[PDB]
């Protein structure tokens, strides 16, 4: 996740600018979308983040 | 909900009648606008209808 944000930031700023995801959102919807094994989203992807 | 099913359904077939989801997914839909404080644990509608 380290590596994506410092390098590949750009790549996923769709996901950034998702008005629907706040930036605790946005980063727990990151991390899941790479290193899919971590996938949870019982506890809130908020809190994740 | 209950008492809506029984009289009041017909102003909510917007909700019914859409393609994007499912019957339980349309009960679940309508069950949160119902009630619409009461947040569930973040789980699929599909489970919830």
Same mark, same amino acid.
Do not use: C, W
């Given at each position: 996740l380290?590596?994506?944000?410092? !390098?590949?930031?750009?790549?996923?700023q769709?996901?950034f600018?998702?008005?629907?995801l +706040?930036?605790? !959102?946005?980063?727990?919807?990151?991390?899941?979308?790479?290193?899919?094994?971590?996938?949870m989203?019982?506890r809130l992807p908020q +809190?994740?983040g």
């Open positions: 380290l590596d994506v944000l410092s !390098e590949q930031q750009e790549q996923h769709d996901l600018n998702s008005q629907r +706040t930036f605790s !959102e946005a980063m727990a919807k990151l991390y899941q979308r790479l290193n899919p094994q971590v996938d989203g019982q +809190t994740i």
